[PDB]
Design a binder for this molecule. Sequence first.
Ligand SMILES: CC[C@H]1OC(=O)[C@H](C)[C@@H](OC(=O)NCCCOCCC#Cc2ccc3c(=O)c(C(=O)O)cn(C)c3c2)[C@H](C)[C@@H](O[C@@H]2O[C@H](C)C[C@H](N(C)C)[C@H]2O)[C@](C)(OC)C[C@@H](C)C(=O)[C@H](C)[C@H]2NC(=O)O[C@@]21C
Ligand SMILES: [Mg+2]
Lengths: 175, 215, 122, 37
Amino acid sequence: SRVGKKIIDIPSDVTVTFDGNHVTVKGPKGELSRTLNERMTFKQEENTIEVVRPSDSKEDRTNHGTTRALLNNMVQGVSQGYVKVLELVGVGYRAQMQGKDLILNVGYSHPVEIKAEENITFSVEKNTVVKVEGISKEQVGALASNIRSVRPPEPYKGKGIRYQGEYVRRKEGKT
Amino acid sequence: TKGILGRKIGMTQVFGENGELIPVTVVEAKENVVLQKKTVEVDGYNAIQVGFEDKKAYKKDAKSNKYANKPAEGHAKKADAAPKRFIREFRNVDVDAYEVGQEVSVDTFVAGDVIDVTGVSKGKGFQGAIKRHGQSRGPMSHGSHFHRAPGSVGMASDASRVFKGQKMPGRMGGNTVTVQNLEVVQVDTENKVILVKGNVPGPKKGLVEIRTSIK
Amino acid sequence: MIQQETRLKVADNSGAREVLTIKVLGGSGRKTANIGDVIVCTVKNATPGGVVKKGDVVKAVIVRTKSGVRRNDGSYIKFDENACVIIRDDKGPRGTRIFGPVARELREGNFMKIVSLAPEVL
Amino acid sequence: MKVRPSVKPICEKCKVIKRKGKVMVICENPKHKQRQG
RNA sequence: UAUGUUAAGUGGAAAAGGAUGUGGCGUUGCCCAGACAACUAGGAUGUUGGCUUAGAAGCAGCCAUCAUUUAAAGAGUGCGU
RNA sequence: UUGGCACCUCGAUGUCGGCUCAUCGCAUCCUGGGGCUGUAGUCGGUCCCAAGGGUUGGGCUGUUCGCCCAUUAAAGCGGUACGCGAGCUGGGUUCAGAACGUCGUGAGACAGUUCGGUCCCUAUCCGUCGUGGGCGUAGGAAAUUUGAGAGGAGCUGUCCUU
RNA sequence: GGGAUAAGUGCUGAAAGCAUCUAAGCAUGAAGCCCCCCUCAAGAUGAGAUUUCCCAACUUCGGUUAUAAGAUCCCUCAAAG
Ligand SMILES: CC[C@H]1OC(=O)[C@H](C)[C@@H](OC(=O)NCCCOCCC#Cc2ccc3c(=O)c(C(=O)O)cn(C)c3c2)[C@H](C)[C@@H](O[C@@H]2O[C@H](C)C[C@H](N(C)C)[C@H]2O)[C@](C)(OC)C[C@@H](C)C(=O)[C@H](C)[C@H]2NC(=O)O[C@@]21C
Ligand SMILES: [Mg+2]
């Protein structure tokens, strides 16, 4: 696995506590704690960490590269942070806050409210651009998906909550 | 939340605020007394037992349930109460709002609650498939000899048997039935009567277990 | 209680002097109807002339019945004959008058032109 | 979603993948999404 | 007991066909001059030149498909009408 | 389904429709979730997941079927001895009467029509629906009980609002 | 109204430095599954739980009377048959 072996990781002003299996990364923006694969072992030199597979078996390899990028995501995220941008297109389609929760007005004859969680923060911009931010890449991904599932883009006028810079295949149905 | 043991007296009618005829049943709840307070660590589930009516006290040589037997006198004297005739218990209630020995009074119910009345049906005795099971009966003419009996009880060689649950003649009645989402129109505290909109199960002079709707 | 194969009088000047019913609209398996309910029916006696002629299939509304109706206060209104009125698929009559009394319950069904063109609302 | 015992690429942009036991094609043309086979 | 195979309860019912499921044995064309990835590095020129076709210059169809601005380049590998 | 085979049943396994009662499969008719579309939403078409429930009343024929008239959200396809006659009918078909057309010299014949034509049985066992008694639950009793399990429900329309 | 799911939709993610719903993990999702709602249910021989009532005196050794507490016989009845 190139991802796993070849690409060595780079702890940058963070504290990667490899406590046996359960690792514990902390830095500017907070602490993330995961249990990585058992059979794998880790070699932390100065300002660098390296993952090693036990064998050359498919299992050991598919797992190897998987939780070598799951460390990088933690260290790269507890230091620089992970953010997702969602745009809202459409006459009357808005985006507004309410005590760290997000009310959405997307033409649903009812206001939709996404409540926020730990280590996660929402923000709007010109009432159209929502922004989810946090340290886990899989929370920023989970929430941003939840907020696009409210009204995903449609194929005729593109109206809906689209990821910033996401190709919306536009059909041209006519009257 | 609330529960009272009563008995059914009959049905009448009341007129409502806008003139509507309200069909009602008169239920008589009097001297409902708590006799125990079941608890989770003592019995495994928290609830309270209410005794209704009033039997006479023990007498030697009693020949009827009119008088209490020695076993029941003791159970009721531990709650300083008189021997009672009907004993049931309630789980929906908060066991800590009741005390062993209190009277449950008709006024527990205010006008416009939602209650469930659980009684026993009236006995119809041994009946047949058309009254007991609502079955369409056969032709009464055109040379028929199949007037009221139930039809086929099965198939043929496949399942050379009658399946369980085949709706056949027998006793009708004597079943606990719970009508749901009834309401009380008035509670009278002096004659001790809770009036309930609609109709309830049972013969006249029966027993109904009114408590608060679970829905 | 009006079911199919029931003959009703027409209380209007549509042409139809008397009609019988086929179905009671309002539901699968619906069997009966009372005041304020619509039925499909085919006239059996027409006036010479008139807009509706004999043997036609028509929508119609029940205006009075012998079974009659309970009202919310325990008051009952009964009548001495079944009766009906033809409609133009807009809750409006086909004829220009309306003969005989009508029950107040037709007000609710928005058969207002039937209630307005009536000798007695009851 | 076509479910056909024969799942094969329809376009050059068509990728056969094996998800959860089933040989499927995911493509950018939603018409070319296929499932069994 | 030894050495290997399967991951489907296959074992413990079918078939034409379909498949980056996995194991073995060869054969092979490429690769430290550094093939293979997205390697986010350039992508166009007289020029659709000729038949230019609904005008249509990678699409309604004959392609005549010339050298390279160039480490790498095609009258465009190609998604398009 | 139309057949082929002739393996159980001729010391008899009542055969067609209808009625009463159902029960099960899903290759789903409606309802629920979806991918789609040559889907702008209503529209429809296609495919997938789905069997919980529901899945009309009549005219015509003995008819199953089919056609037709009104509805419905839909008016599903099959198994069950083409489910069910010791539960019912007996219109069709299949006894004896008769008659027409046809064939036969004739007696008679036709799966050609037509009118008429006896549906027996007091339930032993298993099964099933209710209802008692005996005994066991390490004393004899009166009352209140948890719930291992089991059964029942489970459908859906229109209008208004946005 | 919960909980777990079906087709499906994803999130992070490598084998296969790209991708990618999948292999680890973790989400969402149906009149369907489980609970929730109604009823029967300790012959549930695993025979369960709570409260109360009854409690001696002959044995020559219980393989013991008769009695408690409790019922029944019998009789007047029906809200039951
Ligand atoms: C009243 C008590 C007696 O019962 C009975 O009469 C019942 C009613 C009778 O039911 C039936 O008719 N079938 C059910 C009705 C079937 O309709 C279809 C239309 C037809 C026909 C037809 C065809 C040919 C002939 C025929 O050719 C001819 C002639 O003269 O040649 C005379 N006609 C009349 C024919 C008529 C019993 C049950 C009958 O059995 C049944 O017959 C069949 C042969 C087989 C049946 N299975 C095996 C499928 C069988 O179950 C018998 C034969 O009775 C005649 C029963 C025998 C034992 C008796 O003799 C008993 C003692 C009766 N005698 C009496 O006095 O008590 C009786 C019990
Ligand atoms: Mg024999």
